[PDB]
Structure 1
Amino acid sequence: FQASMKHNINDNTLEIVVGDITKETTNVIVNAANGSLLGGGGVDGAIHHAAGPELLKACQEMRNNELNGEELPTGEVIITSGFQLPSRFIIHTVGPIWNQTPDLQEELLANCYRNALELVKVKKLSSISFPSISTGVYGYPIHEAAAIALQTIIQFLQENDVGLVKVVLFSERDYSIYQEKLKYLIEKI
């Protein structure tokens, strides 16, 4: 069993679900990466394993070329192919590390979502899946991160035509928090 809920915001749809993000057939899936775009554990690890080795080579080519060796800055995004993933593209983003930059970190986390959704708009794609950014080894508390993710996504969908946005969570616990936070946020609209 895998729980799910949805809500329509104008002609967009927001869905939260339990599942494996690497099995999503949306146009885009989002990877919670590190600035170096090197393979790690967690969701990033699952994404590299499902994508195949062409994903790491593609990411390192982009780092050495369009980024000129620089780290992907916190909140910013890049896009690659999906390779062996069932999506067309992967948008890589870097979430804030909890309490590294206290008065900026809420804004930075929000930037991940905003910059990803803006890229979907530009490329004229119509479906995107997000995992829970920064709530792995980066330690952002899930209750706070969930509120920022949902507030930012709902805000964007209220103001733009995108299509379908999914938040795909491997954890039933993370799901349970998102469900109550989304329900809360919906009541306030």
Structure 2
Amino acid sequence: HMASMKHNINDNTLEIVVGDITKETTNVIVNAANGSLLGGGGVAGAIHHAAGPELLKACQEMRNNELNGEELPTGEVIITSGFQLPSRFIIHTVGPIWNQTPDLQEELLANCYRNALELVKVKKLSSISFPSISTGVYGYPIHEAAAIALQTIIQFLQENDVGLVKVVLFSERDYSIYQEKLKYLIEKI
């Protein structure tokens, strides 16, 4: 059952939608990766499959050249082409491992969103879709992650002109959680 909602934040639009992020026609989609940039869970696989094999090659080059063979640190971002995807670019990020660094993980998760949005702003890209970063069966609790995600996006869109930001959720359950949290956040502006 397809569902979405939109709320304007100054001249920006924030949308939450049930959907397959690989099919988004926003200029940018976000891949929540492992630090190698070669894998990751859930959407990562689907993104690599849908983008084609040139993506993995572009990730390997980023790893070799810009990252000097190192993992992308948690909360940072890099950008590649989208290759076969209907989106033009992929911003790749690494979300924190839930309870690895309890006192830093809220900021680190926030960083994924804020660094992605800054890049979009600097590069004058006008639309971006995020997946649910770091969530999953062995991961960050959806209720707290959703709150950090929306809070961070709302605060950024209050202070910056960006355009359209989507949160694309494959799970109806997750969408409903984002919907409640968003209502709660918009009334208490």
TM-score class, shorter: over 0.9
* In 1, Cα distance between equivalents of 2:138 and 2:57: 24
User: Aligned partners of 1:136 and 1:122: how far apart in 2?
Assistant: 31
TM-score, structure 2 as length reference: 0.98
Cα distance in 1 for partners of 2:85, 2:136 equals 21
Identity across the alignment (%)? 99
Measured at CA, do residues 127 and 172 of structure 1 come closer, stay the same or move farther in structure 2, by a change above 3 Å? same
Instruction: For residues 38-93 of structure 1, give each alpha carbon's deviation from its aligned partner in whole angstroms, at most 9, with x where no partner exists.
Output: 12441100000000010001000110011110100000000000000111100000
Output the CA distance in 1 between the equivalents of 2:138 and 2:37.
Answer: 15
In the alignment, the residues of structure 2 paired with residue 162 and residue 127 of structure 1 have an alpha-carbon distance, to the nearest angstrom, of 7
Aligned partners of 1:22, 1:99: CA distance in 2, in Å? 29
Q: Report if aligned partners of 1:97, 1:138 keep a CA contact under 8 Å in 2.
A: no
1:120-170 per-position Cα deviation (integer Å, ceiling 9, x unaligned): 001001000000000026500000000000000000000000000000000
| Equivalent residues, number | 188
Paired residues of 1:80 and 1:90 also in contact (CA < 8 A) = yes
- In structure 2, the CA distance between the partners of 1:16 and 1:124, relative to structure 1 (3 Å rule), is same
Q: Report how far residue 32 of structure 1 moved.
A: 0.5
Quickly say closer, same or farther: Cα 1:8–1:188, change in 2 above 3 A: same
User: Counterpart of 1:71 in 2: which secondary structure?
Assistant: coil
Cα distance, 1:128–1:24 mapped onto 2, change above 3 Å: same
For the Cα contact (< 8 Å) 2:32–2:44, is it kept in 1?
yes
Counterpart contact for 1:29–1:87, Cα < 8 Å = yes
Is the Cα–Cα contact under 8 Å of residues 32 and 40 in structure 2 kept in the other structure?
no
Q: Is the 8 A contact 1:96 1:138 kept in 2?
A: no
**8 Å contact 2:129–2:167 — kept in the other structure?**
yes
Q: TM-score by structure 1 length? A: 0.98
Following the alignment from structure 1 to structure 2, what is the Cα–Cα distance between the partners of residues 66 and 167? Answer: 28
- Write the distance in 2 (CA, Å) between the matches of 1:161 and 1:41: 31
Q: Which runs of 5+ in 1 are unaligned?
A: none
Report the aligned-residue RMSD.
0.8
Q: Alignment partner of 1:139: what SS?
A: coil
Contact (CA 8 Å) 2:127, 2:165: kept in 1 or not? yes
Q: Which moved more, 1:31-40 or 1:148-157?
A: 31-40
